[PDB]
Design an enzyme around this catalytic site. Structure first.
Site, PDB file in Angstrom:
ATOM      1  N   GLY A  21       0.790  -1.229   0.000  1.00 59.99           N
ATOM      2  CA  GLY A  21       0.000   0.000   0.000  1.00 59.99           C
ATOM      3  C   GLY A  21       0.821   1.278   0.000  1.00 59.99           C
ATOM      4  N   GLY A  26      -3.415   3.893   2.066  1.00 62.37           N
ATOM      5  CA  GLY A  26      -2.797   4.025   3.398  1.00 62.37           C
ATOM      6  C   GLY A  26      -1.587   3.125   3.470  1.00 62.37           C
ATOM      7  N   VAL A  28      -0.081  -0.132   3.948  1.00 58.69           N
ATOM      8  CA  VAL A  28      -0.388  -1.553   4.017  1.00 58.69           C
ATOM      9  C   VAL A  28       0.870  -2.410   3.795  1.00 58.69           C
ATOM     10  CG1 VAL A  28      -1.965  -3.341   3.215  1.00 58.69           C
ATOM     11  CG2 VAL A  28      -2.567  -0.944   2.987  1.00 58.69           C
ATOM     12  N   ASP A  91      -5.974 -11.582   7.681  1.00 57.97           N
ATOM     13  CA  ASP A  91      -5.512 -12.736   6.893  1.00 57.97           C
ATOM     14  C   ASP A  91      -5.005 -12.189   5.546  1.00 57.97           C
ATOM     15  OD1 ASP A  91      -6.053 -15.171   8.421  1.00 57.97           O
ATOM     16  OD2 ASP A  91      -8.194 -14.905   7.969  1.00 57.97           O
ATOM     17  N   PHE A  92      -3.842 -12.639   5.099  1.00 61.85           N
ATOM     18  CA  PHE A  92      -3.308 -12.175   3.803  1.00 61.85           C
ATOM     19  C   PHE A  92      -4.021 -12.783   2.591  1.00 61.85           C
ATOM     20  CE2 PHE A  92      -0.195 -12.426   0.276  1.00 61.85           C
ATOM     21  CZ  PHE A  92       0.007 -11.067   0.080  1.00 61.85           C
ATOM     22  N   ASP A 136     -17.591   1.459  -1.100  1.00 61.93           N
ATOM     23  CA  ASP A 136     -16.398   1.635  -1.908  1.00 61.93           C
ATOM     24  C   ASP A 136     -16.189   0.439  -2.838  1.00 61.93           C
ATOM     25  OD1 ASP A 136     -14.319   3.162  -2.880  1.00 61.93           O
ATOM     26  OD2 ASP A 136     -12.906   2.544  -1.293  1.00 61.93           O
TER      27      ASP A 136
HETATM   28  C1  LIG Z   1      -8.164  -0.822   0.574  1.00 61.62           C
HETATM   29  N1  LIG Z   1      -6.808  -1.318   0.509  1.00 61.62           N
HETATM   30  C2  LIG Z   1      -6.428  -2.513   1.146  1.00 61.62           C
HETATM   31  N2  LIG Z   1      -6.173  -2.729   2.436  1.00 61.62           N
HETATM   32  C3  LIG Z   1      -5.794  -3.982   2.799  1.00 61.62           C
HETATM   33  C4  LIG Z   1      -5.478  -4.238   4.268  1.00 61.62           C
HETATM   34  C5  LIG Z   1      -5.752  -4.947   1.771  1.00 61.62           C
HETATM   35  C6  LIG Z   1      -5.399  -6.313   1.692  1.00 61.62           C
HETATM   36  N3  LIG Z   1      -4.575  -6.717   0.654  1.00 61.62           N
HETATM   37  C7  LIG Z   1      -4.180  -8.041   0.533  1.00 61.62           C
HETATM   38  N4  LIG Z   1      -3.306  -8.471  -0.550  1.00 61.62           N
HETATM   39  C8  LIG Z   1      -3.017  -7.676  -1.736  1.00 61.62           C
HETATM   40  C9  LIG Z   1      -2.426  -8.398  -2.791  1.00 61.62           C
HETATM   41  C10 LIG Z   1      -2.100  -7.738  -3.967  1.00 61.62           C
HETATM   42  C11 LIG Z   1      -2.368  -6.339  -4.080  1.00 61.62           C
HETATM   43  C12 LIG Z   1      -2.959  -5.612  -3.050  1.00 61.62           C
HETATM   44  N5  LIG Z   1      -3.215  -4.172  -3.253  1.00 61.62           N
HETATM   45  C13 LIG Z   1      -2.162  -3.757  -4.132  1.00 61.62           C
HETATM   46  C14 LIG Z   1      -2.641  -3.454  -5.506  1.00 61.62           C
HETATM   47  C15 LIG Z   1      -4.038  -2.925  -5.514  1.00 61.62           C
HETATM   48  N6  LIG Z   1      -4.329  -1.865  -4.581  1.00 61.62           N
HETATM   49  C16 LIG Z   1      -4.939  -0.661  -5.206  1.00 61.62           C
HETATM   50  C17 LIG Z   1      -5.349   0.585  -4.436  1.00 61.62           C
HETATM   51  O1  LIG Z   1      -5.148  -0.633  -6.420  1.00 61.62           O
HETATM   52  C18 LIG Z   1      -4.111  -1.839  -3.135  1.00 61.62           C
HETATM   53  C19 LIG Z   1      -3.699  -3.106  -2.410  1.00 61.62           C
HETATM   54  C20 LIG Z   1      -3.281  -6.270  -1.853  1.00 61.62           C
HETATM   55  N7  LIG Z   1      -4.596  -8.989   1.416  1.00 61.62           N
HETATM   56  C21 LIG Z   1      -5.434  -8.612   2.462  1.00 61.62           C
HETATM   57  C22 LIG Z   1      -5.847  -7.269   2.621  1.00 61.62           C
HETATM   58  C23 LIG Z   1      -6.772  -6.898   3.707  1.00 61.62           C
HETATM   59  N8  LIG Z   1      -7.481  -6.598   4.582  1.00 61.62           N
HETATM   60  S1  LIG Z   1      -6.134  -4.030   0.412  1.00 61.62           S
END
Ligand SMILES: CNc1nc(C)c(-c2nc(Nc3cccc(N4CCCN(C(C)=O)CC4)c3)ncc2C#N)s1
EC number: 2.7.11.22
Lengths: 308, 252
Positions: A21, A26, A28, A91-92, A136
């Site tokens: 993130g 934010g 992340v 959880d991821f 959202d």
């Molecule tokens: C609203 N944003 C988010 N917050 C959390 C805590 C998120 C989250 N993300 C993952 N895994 C993950 C894997 C691959 C990409 C992402 N993205 C990166 C690219 C896309 N992205 C945007 C704004 O386009 C933001 C995040 C995230 N696993 C668990 C959680 C949770 N809770 S995502």
């Protein structure tokens, strides 16, 4: 000065692997539990201020994440402090729908697209049944696990609802924001999330957000060039909107939803469902329950597990 | 768990405060007095009884983990209330809460210059304390209060306005006056309140056609043995509380 703290563990128990993130969403991080290897996502609670102690916005999200427990909703494991600041631990999830779709290598079958939409709509059914609006809905907030389970994510703008409400109008990313909001509605409900599911469904074929405005008026123009133009005939009572006379939008447009997407989306049922999601009048817009029942999920190829 | 914030009587004897030499009775007072501070501030800040009750529970639980010897109720109460109003969607401004707490605890002193060092510190202190509350409660802030259940129960036994109002009264006084919120689930407590209100009013709910008592419709666990034991306890402390009983006493 070293207080007892049984129920709030230090985030140092997790080992940061990588930011994922930047910008808007934010800070992340991907992390690893130091004992078990369990992968998690850490979102820090931003304190740009507050003038007002712990952000009421974060309290709201925490309340909502604690309420929502479902296979298609992201899972808040716990909240952690720091040897002052605060982290939400989830959880991821390996993938993010926005990434998958913006990746030319990645390819969906009609069967899997069906599955994705099924999980998403089922998540919506659950959150709404629990009196929550996500507010959202957008591809980037939809996660998918290594095992092909879709999770709705980012409840940071979500809010409980009920049954003249004065909810906030400045909700939902512009490209996914429904007509109601753009016309200034503050007594809206679950239909706003479904409009977003529509835009995302269409995005499963177009691989790109169908309606990319730059301002509210530009958005409303784009919407009109796709869903016809806002007419009290089409949308009963769309009259009593302040911003209705003041909108200076189009007048001759007719619904092009099935024609303009006809190209990308082969399947007739797919097009019919998308059409019923991208309906102008929130009250005539299909709900998650009916959408799940739509023949798109009950004809061949039937929905299948994810691997592409 | 679902057992996390509910404690056995033995657990209640071994409170953090006992471990620092505070008598049981003294500790109950410390609670009572904090609940009073919460009630007083809450009414002056014009927040709902619901929010006050939420702050009161936060307070109860906070002190199963912390000691009154380390954290004085006059410090925790305002922070707890600040938080409960945020959580319950009647957010009150931090300065406002500091101000009201100041007048409550120091009617005769005079508020410092909101530019001063002394004031800036106490603003920071409250924010810090809200944080120690959050952490102590492990961010579990969604509280269920007996009252929701009171209304449910007093309707499904056709009680007068009066009976119902008295039952709600008991419910609120149970929070100020007892540690029932730490021992018994909200619905069980609600049965206790409706029980006592009945006993106090000379109202009796007649046995259902099935032979089932009213409380069975509300909680499978509840026994008259327990109800009588609890109402006795609650009524005792009510008797000890100057003027409380007057408020529901039939003077006609
Ligand atoms: C609203 N944003 C988010 N917050 C959390 C805590 C998120 C989250 N993300 C993952 N895994 C993950 C894997 C691959 C990409 C992402 N993205 C990166 C690219 C896309 N992205 C945007 C704004 O386009 C933001 C995040 C995230 N696993 C668990 C959680 C949770 N809770 S995502």
């Amino acid at each position: 000065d070293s207080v007892e703290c049984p129920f709030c563990d230090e985030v140092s128990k997790y080992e940061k692997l990588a930011k994922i993130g930047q910008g808007t969403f934010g800070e992340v991080f991907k992390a690893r539990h130091r004992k078990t290897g369990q992968k998690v996502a850490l979102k820090k609670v931003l304190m740009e201020n507050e003038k007002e102690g712990f952000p009421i916005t974060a309290l709201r999200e925490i309340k909502i994440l604690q309420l929502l427990k479902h296979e298609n909703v992201v899972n808040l494991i716990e909240i952690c402090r720091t040897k002052a600041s605060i982290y939400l631990v989830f959880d991821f999830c390996e993938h993010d729908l926005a990434g998958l779709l913006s990746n030319v290598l990645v390819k969906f079958t009609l069967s899997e697209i069906k599955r994705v939409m099924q999980m998403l709509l089922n998540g919506l059914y659950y959150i709404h049944r629990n009196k929550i609006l996500h507010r959202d809905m957008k591809a980037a907030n939809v996660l998918i696990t290594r095992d092909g389970v879709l999770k709705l994510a980012d409840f940071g703008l979500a809010r409980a609802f009920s049954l003249p409400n004065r909810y906030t109008n400045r909700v939902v990313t512009l490209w996914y924001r429904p007509p109601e909001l753009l016309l200034g509605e503050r007594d809206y409900g679950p239909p706003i999330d479904l409009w977003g599911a529509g835009c995302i469904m269409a995005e499963m074929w177009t691989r790109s957000p169908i309606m990319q405005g730059n301002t509210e008026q530009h958005q409303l123009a784009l919407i009109s060039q796709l869903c016809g133009s806002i007419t009290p005939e089409v949308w009963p009572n769309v009259d009593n909107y302040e911003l209705y006379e003041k909108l200076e939008l189009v007048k001759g447009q007719k619904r092009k939803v099935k024609d303009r997407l006809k190209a990308y989306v082969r399947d007739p049922y797919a097009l019919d469902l998308i059409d019923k999601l991208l309906v102008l009048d929130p009250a005539q817009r299909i709900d998650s329950d009916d959408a799940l029942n739509h023949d798109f999920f009950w004809s061949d190829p039937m929905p299948s597990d994810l691997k592409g | 768990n679902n057992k996390r914030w509910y404690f056995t009587r033995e657990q209640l004897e071994n409170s953090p405060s006992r471990r620092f030499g505070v008598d049981p009775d003294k500790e109950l007072s410390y609670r009572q007095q904090a609940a009073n501070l919460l009630q007083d501030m809450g009414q002056r800040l014009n927040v709902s009884q619901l929010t006050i009750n939420t702050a009161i529970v936060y307070m109860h639980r906070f002190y199963m983990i912390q000691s009154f010897t380390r954290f004085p109720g006059n410090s925790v109460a305002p922070a707890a209330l600040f938080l409960a109003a945020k959580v319950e969607g009647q957010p009150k401004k931090l300065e406002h809460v500091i101000k009201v707490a100041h007048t409550c605890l120091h009617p005769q002193e005079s508020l410092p210059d909101t530019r001063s060092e002394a004031y800036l510190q106490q603003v920071q202190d409250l924010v810090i304390l809200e944080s120690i509350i959050l952490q102590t409660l492990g961010f579990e802030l969604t509280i269920d209060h007996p009252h929701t259940h009171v209304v449910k129960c007093t309707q499904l036994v056709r009680a007068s306005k009066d009976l119902a109002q008295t039952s709600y009264f008991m419910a609120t006084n149970s929070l100020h006056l007892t540690t029932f919120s730490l021992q018994y689930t909200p619905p069980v407590v609600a049965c206790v309140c409706i029980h006592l209100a009945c006993k106090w009013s000379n109202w009796e709910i007649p046995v259902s056609t099935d032979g089932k008592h009213w409380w069975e419709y509300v909680d499978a666990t509840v026994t008259l043995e327990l109800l009588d034991e609890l109402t006795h306890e609650l009524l005792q402390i009510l008797e000890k509380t100057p003027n409380r009983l007057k408020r529901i006493w039939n003077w006609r």
